[PDB]
């Protein structure tokens, strides 16, 4: 997969590590020449492996020297500054002397501080404020930056506050370096900062994924207090037949404790919950591609929709907070399969609102759950 990109060995292994060597399209058309230390303007869609590629790129550039950070990657949410850190250091899983740290507010900067004096590392991650803060007392010397990577743009650049810190934060680092820019969306405020931020960049714009529908499949809902969840979904798993289903809850306690009582009742199945580290969710979803029935609890998986064949049920045991979040829950999109059967449950008379605002959306109706449903109009094979 990535072996076509010509990467370090280190760096592959880690990626054979994390469970995918099938590259998405983003990465077929940036990790090449981000590669060679071009100056890049992507416009892609957050996931689809898009911080992989300049955490890649960048790996596989990395001059590691002591003491000098050489990467400075910036974005808006210091939620994403946080994950795109666990990923450097995933990738960096073989690679024993490359050093990150991510710094933003909410923890004290006395704390950046000391690691900064102390233990400098090589790659740094942060929102502009913490960095731009850190720089002009002296704490981050960014005269050694060979790459400045820019995530989420378009709401970095939106504000002219921000954007204002960011000139400033690059002012401060070498003339000669590669600059990359990620933005799901491309504003007329990017367009100008990066004519000051890069020379003469690949633009890349990738497409929006192209995706979302529930042609062919068959939906059905169930009105139910929580009280009685457990005992329907149960009486459910007994009627209908499945080779695997998918049950989506709406916290990482009830997804946690749904799994648990499942496995006790010989039901084998694994929770994948918003509260674990990447990795792990990365591994135990790739383990849910084994077994004859096994049952999947999560709150929420990757945005690449179902694409597991033998997945044949997906339950809403709570209501999606949206119903963009229905859409994702629930449609094929692996190698073959187009059926598939989707049951909600209802226990407020506000679900309801949200169930009516999904029939409009797409345009279905989704009835009651019937007594009698036949096992070919949701499993196409058998």
Do not use: C, P, W
């Given at each position: 997969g990535f072996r076509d990109f010509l990467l370090k060995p280190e760096l592959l292994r880690a990626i054979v590590d994390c469970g995918f060597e099938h590259p998405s399209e983003v990465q077929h058309e940036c990790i090449p020449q981000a590669i060679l230390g071009m100056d890049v303007l992507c416009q892609a869609?957050?996931?689809?492996?898009?911080?992989?590629?300049?955490?890649?790129?960048?790996?596989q550039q990395l001059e590691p020297v002591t003491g000098q950070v050489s990467v400075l990657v910036m974005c808006?949410?210091?939620?994403?500054?946080?994950?795109?850190?666990?990923?450097?250091?995933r990738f960096s899983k073989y690679m024993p002397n490359v050093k990150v740290a991510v710094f933003f507010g909410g923890l004290?900067?006395?704390?950046?501080?000391?690691?900064?004096?102390?233990?400098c590392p090589h790659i740094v991650v942060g929102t502009p404020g913490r960095i731009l803060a850190l720089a002009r007392n002296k704490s981050l010397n960014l005269k050694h930056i060979k790459?400045?990577?820019?995530?989420?743009?378009?709401?970095?650049?939106?504000?002219?506050?921000?954007?204002?810190?960011?000139?400033?934060?690059?002012?401060?680092t070498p003339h000669e370096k590669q600059v990359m820019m990620f933005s799901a969306t491309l504003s007329k405020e990017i367009r100008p900062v990066c004519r000051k931020f890069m020379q003469d960049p690949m633009e890349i714009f990738v497409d929006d994924e192209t995706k979302l529908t529930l042609h062919?499949?068959?939906?059905?809902?169930?009105?139910?207090?929580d009280n009685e969840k457990n005992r329907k979904l149960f009486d459910l798993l007994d009627v209908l037949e499945f080779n695997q289903v998918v049950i989506f809850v709406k916290s990482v306690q009830r997804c946690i404790a749904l799994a648990q009582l499942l496995v006790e009742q010989n039901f084998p199945a694994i929770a994948i919950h918003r509260g674990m580290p990447q990795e792990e969710r990365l591994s135990r979803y790739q383990q849910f591609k084994d077994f004859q029935r096994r049952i999947l609890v999560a709150t929420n998986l990757f945005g690449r929709g179902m694409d597991i064949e033998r997945v044949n049920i997906a339950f809403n045991y709570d209501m999606p907070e949206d119903s963009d979040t229905y859409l994702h829950r629930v449609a094929r999109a692996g190698r073959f399969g187009t059926?598939?059967?989707?049951?909600?449950?209802?226990?407020?008379?506000?679900?309801?609102?949200?169930?009516?605002?999904?029939?409009?959306?797409f345009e279905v109706n989704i009835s009651e759950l019937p007594d009698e449903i036949d096992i070919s109009s949701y499993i196409e094979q058998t």
């Open positions: 869609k957050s996931g689809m492996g898009k911080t992989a590629v300049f955490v890649l790129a960048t790996l808006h949410t210091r939620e994403l500054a946080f994950q795109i850190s666990k990923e450097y250091e004290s900067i006395k704390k950046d501080e000391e690691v900064l004096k102390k233990n790459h400045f990577i820019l995530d989420e743009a378009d709401k970095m650049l939106e504000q002219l506050d921000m954007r204002r810190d960011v000139q400033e934060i690059f002012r401060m062919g499949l068959q939906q059905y809902y169930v009105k139910l207090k059926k598939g059967l989707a049951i909600t449950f209802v226990s407020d008379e506000n679900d309801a609102k949200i169930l009516n605002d999904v029939q409009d959306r």
